[PDB]
Design an enzyme around this catalytic site. Structure first.
Site, PDB file in Angstrom:
ATOM      1  N   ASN A   1      -7.050 -19.973 -10.232  1.00 28.12           N
ATOM      2  CA  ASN A   1      -8.392 -19.415 -10.132  1.00 28.12           C
ATOM      3  C   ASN A   1      -8.409 -17.951  -9.689  1.00 28.12           C
ATOM      4  O   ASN A   1      -9.158 -17.116 -10.206  1.00 28.12           O
ATOM      5  CB  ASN A   1      -9.311 -20.248  -9.190  1.00 28.12           C
ATOM      6  CG  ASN A   1     -10.766 -19.803  -9.183  1.00 28.12           C
ATOM      7  OD1 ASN A   1     -11.217 -19.046  -8.300  1.00 28.12           O
ATOM      8  ND2 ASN A   1     -11.538 -20.265 -10.149  1.00 28.12           N
TER       9      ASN A   1
ATOM     10  N   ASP B   1      -6.272   6.513  -4.924  1.00 26.77           N
ATOM     11  CA  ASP B   1      -5.854   5.147  -5.049  1.00 26.77           C
ATOM     12  C   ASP B   1      -5.889   4.687  -6.505  1.00 26.77           C
ATOM     13  O   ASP B   1      -6.162   5.452  -7.418  1.00 26.77           O
ATOM     14  CB  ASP B   1      -6.602   4.232  -4.052  1.00 26.77           C
ATOM     15  CG  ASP B   1      -8.010   3.789  -4.394  1.00 26.77           C
ATOM     16  OD1 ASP B   1      -8.693   3.071  -3.689  1.00 26.77           O
ATOM     17  OD2 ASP B   1      -8.442   4.206  -5.523  1.00 26.77           O
TER      18      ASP B   1
ATOM     19  N   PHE C   1      -8.190  -6.600   3.481  1.00 24.97           N
ATOM     20  CA  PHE C   1      -7.844  -5.237   3.719  1.00 24.97           C
ATOM     21  C   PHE C   1      -8.036  -4.395   2.439  1.00 24.97           C
ATOM     22  O   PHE C   1      -8.574  -3.312   2.437  1.00 24.97           O
ATOM     23  CB  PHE C   1      -6.375  -5.254   4.117  1.00 24.97           C
ATOM     24  CG  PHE C   1      -5.855  -3.888   4.387  1.00 24.97           C
ATOM     25  CD1 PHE C   1      -5.314  -3.085   3.394  1.00 24.97           C
ATOM     26  CD2 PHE C   1      -5.823  -3.438   5.710  1.00 24.97           C
ATOM     27  CE1 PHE C   1      -4.803  -1.831   3.720  1.00 24.97           C
ATOM     28  CE2 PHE C   1      -5.303  -2.203   6.061  1.00 24.97           C
ATOM     29  CZ  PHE C   1      -4.828  -1.358   5.036  1.00 24.97           C
TER      30      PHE C   1
ATOM     31  N   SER D   1     -12.266 -20.140  -5.235  1.00 21.27           N
ATOM     32  CA  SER D   1     -10.906 -19.995  -4.742  1.00 21.27           C
ATOM     33  C   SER D   1     -10.864 -20.366  -3.286  1.00 21.27           C
ATOM     34  O   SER D   1      -9.905 -20.976  -2.833  1.00 21.27           O
ATOM     35  CB  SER D   1     -10.445 -18.542  -4.806  1.00 21.27           C
ATOM     36  OG  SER D   1     -10.283 -18.124  -6.139  1.00 21.27           O
TER      37      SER D   1
ATOM     38  N   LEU E   1      -8.916   3.931   2.876  1.00 18.31           N
ATOM     39  CA  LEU E   1      -9.933   4.556   2.018  1.00 18.31           C
ATOM     40  C   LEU E   1     -10.769   5.589   2.766  1.00 18.31           C
ATOM     41  O   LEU E   1     -11.300   5.304   3.828  1.00 18.31           O
ATOM     42  CB  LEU E   1     -10.907   3.547   1.477  1.00 18.31           C
ATOM     43  CG  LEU E   1     -12.049   4.231   0.730  1.00 18.31           C
ATOM     44  CD1 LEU E   1     -11.544   4.833  -0.574  1.00 18.31           C
ATOM     45  CD2 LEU E   1     -13.105   3.198   0.389  1.00 18.31           C
TER      46      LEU E   1
ATOM     47  N   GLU F   1       0.793  -1.202   0.000  1.00 17.69           N
ATOM     48  CA  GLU F   1       0.000   0.000   0.000  1.00 17.69           C
ATOM     49  C   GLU F   1       0.827   1.253   0.000  1.00 17.69           C
ATOM     50  O   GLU F   1       0.341   2.280  -0.427  1.00 17.69           O
ATOM     51  CB  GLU F   1      -0.834   0.033   1.290  1.00 17.69           C
ATOM     52  CG  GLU F   1      -1.832  -1.127   1.395  1.00 17.69           C
ATOM     53  CD  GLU F   1      -2.957  -1.088   0.382  1.00 17.69           C
ATOM     54  OE1 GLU F   1      -3.755  -1.993   0.221  1.00 17.69           O
ATOM     55  OE2 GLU F   1      -3.005   0.019  -0.294  1.00 17.69           O
TER      56      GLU F   1
END
Length: 164
Positions: free
Chosen positions: A132, A20, A104, A117, A32, A11
């Site tokens: 996948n 972002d 996250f 998945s 965010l 990040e």
């Protein structure tokens, strides 16, 4: 290596409001603020989040505080989620961090949407699950980060990050 260092790699850290990858207003370590197009809506959200008039800028300390809150919320979210919990419980420690990473970034709801998945991870079919996971918008939009995460799921080691 730990979840914090992992996420700090993925990040980055920014002390001024920024946009972002998706165009949303963020601050600190992937925090965010709003999906709203208004920089003003962002600034209001930020002050609300910090408890001070920030005027779009925060200190390292504030960034880390938010980071601590977010990681904590991601973990508790997984543990409370009926689809996520069983997966998490079934995994080894490193793979556990990989799932926290996805949550996250894309929220509980988002990850819980990866039905197939999740099933493969629970079954410990590593190669299959990696393939996948790659068939997603997630992977197409942020390929390098997605690959690092996928590799972590695939191998169960921190190799992808030992570089970085």
């Amino acid at each position: 290596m730990n979840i914090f260092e992992m996420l700090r790699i993925d990040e980055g850290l920014r002390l001024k409001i920024y946009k972002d990858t998706e165009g949303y207003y963020t601050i600190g370590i992937g925090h965010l603020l709003t999906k709203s197009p208004s920089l003003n809506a962002a600034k209001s959200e930020l002050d609300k989040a910090i408890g001070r008039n920030c005027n779009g800028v925060i200190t390292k300390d504030e960034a880390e505080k938010l980071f601590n809150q977010d990681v904590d919320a991601a973990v508790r979210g997984i543990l409370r989620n009926a689809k996520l919990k069983p997966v998490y419980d079934s995994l080894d420690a490193v793979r556990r961090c990989a799932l926290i990473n996805m949550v996250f970034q894309m929220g509980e709801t988002g990850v819980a949407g990866f039905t197939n998945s999740l099933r493969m991870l629970q079954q410990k079919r590593w190669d299959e699950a990696a393939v996948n996971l790659a068939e997603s918008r997630w992977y197409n939009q942020t390929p390098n980060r997605a690959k690092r995460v996928i590799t972590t799921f695939r191998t169960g080691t921190w190799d992808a990050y030992k570089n970085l």
